[PDB]
Structure formats: structure tokens, C-alpha cells
């Protein structure tokens, strides 16, 4: 499929516009250092990626040691929408994919986000995000469980275009994005 540590995500930009982004995480031999690029000089994006990396360090046993590798997360803005406001959960998925050397499911977009407390949050404007996902050729989507309540907000022609999986927590999100749960 795709290179491990690479994944597509779709989310509302800082200006409220749905956009498609590609996370490109590189893993090397190191000490556990997180470097970032493409974060638009945004302290908010950096803090989100940091929350993701902290959760990664704290729960990497449930998925191997991050302290023996160095990570560089580049973020590619594919549709000129600005900074992505929902980066924690996609970054966690990209971190775990990079570590385990497992590729994210082919033609899948990961949607949703993660709070500091470690709970997943429903996709913001899921109808618009999935419209972007369909227009971008995505075939599968991984969604937070709560977003099921928003299924009736999505036009049925659009929602039934996807093969959809649901995750209950960040680790479950990792397993759904890699294709093993």
C-alpha cells in the first residue's frame, strides 16, 4: 500500500474549511526526539502533535520502544486550506504506523481527533469532510464511534460510497487505521 508512517487525513482547517492532508512520518535511529515540519508556524498544531506524541510514548506498550528512534513528522497540505485543526489522532496513527513498520490501509482516510485526556472526539463537519474524501478518491474511512450519531446528517449517496470502520479510543484508532481490528 503506502509507505509506513504515511497516511491521509481530512479535517477542518483553521479557517473552518475541510481539507485533505498527508502525514509523512520518518523514523530513524535516535533517542526519542520529535521533529516537525509543515506546521504553518502554528503553536496550536505543534501542541496537537505534541499531545499525540505524548500519548504515543505513554501507550506504546499496548501496541517496541520510541526512545530508541527519532521521529520527523512532515505535514503536506494538499488542497491549500491552511493549518489543520485536527492533528492529534492522525498524528498518533502515523506515529504508531511508523514504529511498527505497518502500512495504513490502502485508500483509507483517517478522520476525527483526540482530546488531551485521551478520548476521541467526533469528526467536525463530517458531511463536508466526507464530501472532500469522496472527491479525493478515498474508498475507506475510519471514524470515531460517536460520529455514528452524525450518519443521518450525511447524504446517503455520499455515505454509502465508503467502506466505513469505527474506533472507540486512540489505540483502537491505530488498530482500525492499520487494518487489524
Numbering used by the authors: 496 to 558, 562 to 679
Task: Tell me, in the authors' exact words, what the paper reports.
Bacteriophage exclusion (‘BREX’) systems are multi-protein complexes encoded by a variety of bacteria and archaea that restrict phage by an unknown mechanism. The final gene in most type 1 BREX systems, termed ‘BrxL’, encodes a large protein (670–700 residues in various species), with much of its sequence predicted to adopt a fold corresponding to the chambered ATP-dependent AAA+ protein family, which are involved in a wide variety of cellular functions throughout all biological kingdoms. In this study we have demonstrated that the BrxL phage restriction factor is a multimeric DNA binding protein that displays ATP-dependent assembly on double stranded DNA.
To better understand how BrxL’s C-terminal domain relates to those or other protein domains (and to provide a starting model of that domain for subsequent CryoEM studies of the full-length protein) we expressed, purified, and crystallized BrxLC. During the final step of purification by size exclusion chromatography (SEC), we observed that BrxLC eluted at a retention volume consistent with a monomer rather than as a higher order multimers (eventually shown to correspond to hexamers) previously observed in studies of LonPC and RadAC. We obtained crystals and solved the X-ray structure to 2.25 Å resolution. The crystal structure contains 4 subunits in the asymmetric unit, with no obvious higher order symmetry. The backbone atoms of BrxLC superpose well with both domains despite low amino acid sequence identity (BrxLC shares 14% identity with both domains); superposition of BrxLC with RadC generates an RMSD value for 148 structurally equivalent α-carbons of 2.3 Å (P-value 8.97 × 10−14); superposition with LonPC generates an RMSD value for 172 structurally equivalent α-carbons of 3.3 Å (P-value 3.02 × 10−12). A structure-based sequence alignment of the BrxLC with RadAC or LonPC does not demonstrate obvious conservation with previously visualized DNA binding residues with RadAC or with a protease catalytic motif as observed in LonPC. BrxLC’s distinct solution and assembly behaviors, in conjunction with the low sequence conservation relative to LonPC and RadAC, indicate that the BrxLC domain may have adopted a distinct structural role in the function of BrxL as compared to the same domain in LonP or RadA. In contrast, purified BrxLC is monomeric in solution and (in the context of full-length BrxL) appears to mediate dimerization of heptameric (without ATP) or hexameric (with ATP) complexes through protein-protein interactions with another BrxLC partner. In the DNA-bound dodecameric complex, BrxLc domains are far removed from dsDNA occupying the central pore and do not share significant conservation with LonP residues essential for protease activity or with RadA residues involved in DNA binding. These observations imply that BrxL’s CTD has evolved a distinct functional role from the LonPC and RadAC domains.
